[PDB]
Amino acid sequence: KKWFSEFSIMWPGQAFSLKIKKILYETKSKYQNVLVFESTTYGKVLVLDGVIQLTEKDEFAYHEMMTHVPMTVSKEPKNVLVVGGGDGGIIRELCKYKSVENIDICEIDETVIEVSKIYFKNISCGYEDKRVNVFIEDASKFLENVTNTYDVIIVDSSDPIGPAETLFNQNFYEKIYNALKPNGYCVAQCESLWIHVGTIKNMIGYAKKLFKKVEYANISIPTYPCGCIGILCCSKTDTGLTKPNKKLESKEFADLKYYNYENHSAAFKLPAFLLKEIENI
Amino acid sequence: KKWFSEFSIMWPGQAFSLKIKKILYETKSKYQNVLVFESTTYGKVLVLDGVIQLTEKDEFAYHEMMTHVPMTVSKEPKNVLVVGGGDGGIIRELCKYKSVENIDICEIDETVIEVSKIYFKNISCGYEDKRVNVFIEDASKFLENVTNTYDVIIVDSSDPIGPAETLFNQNFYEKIYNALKPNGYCVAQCESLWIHVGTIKNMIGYAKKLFKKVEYANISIPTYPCGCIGILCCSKTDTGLTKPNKKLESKEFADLKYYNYENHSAAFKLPAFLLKEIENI
Numbered sequence: 189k190k191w192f193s194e195f196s197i198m199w200p201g202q203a204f205s206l207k208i209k210k211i212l213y214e215t216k217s218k219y220q221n222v223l224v225f226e227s228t229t230y231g232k233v234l235v236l237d238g239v240i241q242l243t244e245k246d247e248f249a250y251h252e253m254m255t256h257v258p259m260t261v262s263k264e265p266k267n268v269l270v271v272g273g274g275d276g277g278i279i280r281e282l283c284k285y286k287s288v289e290n291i292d293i294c295e296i297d298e299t300v301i302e303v304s305k306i307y308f309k310n311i312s313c314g315y316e317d318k319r320v321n322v323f324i325e326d327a328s329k330f331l332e333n334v335t336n337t338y339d340v341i342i343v344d345s346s347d348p349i350g351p352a353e354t355l356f357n358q359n360f361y362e363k364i365y366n367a368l369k370p371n372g373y374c375v376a377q378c379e380s381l382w383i384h385v386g387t388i389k390n391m392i393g394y395a396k397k398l399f400k401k402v403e404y405a406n407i408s409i410p411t412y413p414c415g416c417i418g419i420l421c422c423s424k425t426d427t428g429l430t431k432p433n434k435k436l437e438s439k440e441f442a443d444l445k446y447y448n449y450e451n452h453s454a455a456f457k458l459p460a461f462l463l464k465e466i467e468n469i
Numbered sequence: 470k471k472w473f474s475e476f477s478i479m480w481p482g483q484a485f486s487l488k489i490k491k492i493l494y495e496t497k498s499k500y501q502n503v504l505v506f507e508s509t510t511y512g513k514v515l516v517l518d519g520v521i522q523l524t525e526k527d528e529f530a531y532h533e534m535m536t537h538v539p540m541t542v543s544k545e546p547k548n549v550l551v552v553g554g555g556d557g558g559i560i561r562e563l564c565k566y567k568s569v570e571n572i573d574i575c576e577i578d579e580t581v582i583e584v585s586k587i588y589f590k591n592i593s594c595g596y597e598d599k600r601v602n603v604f605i606e607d608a609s610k611f612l613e614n615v616t617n618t619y620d621v622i623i624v625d626s627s628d629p630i631g632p633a634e635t636l637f638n639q640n641f642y643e644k645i646y647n648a649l650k651p652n653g654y655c656v657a658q659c660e661s662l663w664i665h666v667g668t669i670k671n672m673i674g675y676a677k678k679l680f681k682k683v684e685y686a687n688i689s690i691p692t693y694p695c696g697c698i699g700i701l702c703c704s705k706t707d708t709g710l711t712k713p714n715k716k717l718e719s720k721e722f723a724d725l726k727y728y729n730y731e732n733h734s735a736a737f738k739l740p741a742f743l744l745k746e747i748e749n750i
């Protein structure tokens with residue numbers, strides 16, 4: 189049996205590896221190299237440009253925290269945009285909210301959607317929901333053109349090397365600000381606090397040029413580098429995203445495996461050295 | 470340049486790797502294989518039987534949370550025992566408390582102490598403190614023979630394969646209970662919640678046969694498998710270890726890099742699936 193190894197200039201000097209049970213699919217899409225394989229202990233794995241995007245064993249941690257942190261703070265969210273997120277995990281969590289009326293998703297690479305529909309059926313099931321509308325487009329351009337404003341925007345991007353290079357700059361967060369309702373919220377995948385704090389500092393600085401409240405949360409997930417990933421949290425209100433406004437008690441949420449009301453707030457309690465680094469931003 | 474890779478039957482199918490700048494020391498001690506190397510991005514690394522014990526870049530997360538969770542809950546701790554912990558990291562954090570009168574450490578492998586004194590001088594500096602007393606002994610036997618009782622016992626063991634095989638059973642926690650003051654606390658390194666929950670369940674069951682309050686906390690640390698490690702927390706009082714009783718404000722603690730008053734409690738806010746698993750223990 190061979191091993192898959194995640195090497196990157198984005199985290200030099202370290203690598204995480206998963207034993208391969210079977211390779212399922214590979215292709216070079218218009219935008220990126222796509223790899224799908226069944227691992228021996230983490231289930232099926234999606235890889236883009238050599239970087240693990242998700243595994244069946246732990247993806248719920250990332251998709252639940254990214255979705256339910258902002259969706260329990262927004263009081264009656266009606267229109268939600270997912271940027272990236274071609275696998276559908278965020279959509280799956282969003283569909284649980286009966287009050288949502290529309291879910292737009294802007295994914296640049298249609299191959300990712302199609303592969304997830306074929307090989308990750310318990311992750312992409314939300315595409316069957318009639319409220320979901322798919323746009324195959326660079327979100328940098330979608331956000332410049334969209335006429336609607338959203339209650340919540342969830343930025344579920346790949347990393348800054350590749351097509352997502354357009355999603356990590358000041359102009360991008362200005363487009364996000366303008367596409368939000370006056371009381372709207374944005375969360376975005378953000379650098380692991382064990383790697384490039386300098387990047388976290390850059391993103392926070394960008395968001396603070398526009399948003400009244402900018403908070404950073406941490407998620408434990410073993411198959412992202414250093415075992416965790418941040419949530420950049422942007423609010424137009426000064427109350428922010430640290431405290432939920434509802435409990436997830438209906439039957440649609442009985443299956444949750446990571447998120448709960450107490451974890452929501454706990455995710456924002458950061459290690460001392462990081463607090464120190466972002467203090468004067 | 471070569472790479473060091475951490476493979477183990479204890480976490481089958483996954484591995485974490487660090488690029489090697491230089492190998493510094495290797496030996497087969499009486500108990501275990503010892504490896505010290507300078508990594509390219511995590512500083513110096515200590516490896517026992519192929520398993521990473523610490524790196525200079527992130528060890529503060531584990532040593533601060535293991536020490537200051539129980540040391541801020543105990544009100545006037547006077548006598549503290551470290552089990553294992555030959556590298557000295559726990560001792561380093563304990564020495565910051567001026568009120569401590571005595572620190573015993575029971576480490577089975579004197580080679581680990583000597584190697585840490587030679588190659589990890591900013592981790593083993595606490596051995597110079599006159600309150601520290603070293604016992605080179607199996608802690609299973611030390612705990613059977615010790616006449617003193619302790620305010621806090623910190624179990625900083627290696628994994629269950631090897632000399633630490635005697636530290637993960639019911640009889641061990643009975644010895645711990647008896648070596649504690651009536652209001653004493655024990656914390657122990659415990660399995661990562663992303664791997665063998667069954668083991669966490671076993672340890673909790675053991676501790677609950679004796680301790681009134683048994684809690685589990687999580688630490689983010691990238692160079693342990695799955696990026697995190699648990700703290701098994703055992704109290705004879707029903708108030709437990711989740712809430713500190715003091716703030717660490719004196720100058721000895723100005724250098725802290727992970728622990729703070731809010732993180733202490735946040736570490737005990739666990740993912741939903743784990744809460745569900747331990748519910749009926």
Ligand SMILES: CSC[C@H]1O[C@@H](n2cnc3c(N)ncnc32)[C@H](O)[C@@H]1O
Nearest residue numbers: 272273274296300327345346351352
């Ligand atoms: C797998 S979830 C991350 C998704 O983000 C998508 N993505 C990357 N860059 C962009 C971009 N500019 N616009 C929209 N989606 C993107 C990637 O194609 C990937 O499927």
Ligand SMILES: CSC[C@H]1O[C@@H](n2cnc3c(N)ncnc32)[C@H](O)[C@@H]1O
Nearest residue numbers: 553554555577581608626627632633
């Ligand atoms: C490096 S910190 C972990 C330490 O736990 C030590 N250790 C392992 N088993 C025991 C044991 N039974 N008694 C005392 N120390 C132990 C190991 O030698 C290691 O140095």
Ligand SMILES: NCCCN[C@H]1CC[C@H](NCCCN)CC1
Nearest residue numbers: 240241242345346347377379380
């Ligand atoms: N919907 C699946 C998630 C896609 N986002 C992932 C977030 C983490 C990233 N690794 C890099 C971590 C350091 N920024 C891969 C894509």
Ligand SMILES: NCCCN[C@H]1CC[C@H](NCCCN)CC1
Nearest residue numbers: 521522523626627628658660661
């Ligand atoms: N004082 C340095 C710490 C020694 N304890 C480590 C704790 C984690 C362990 N990996 C296994 C993690 C799964 N139980 C290595 C030893």
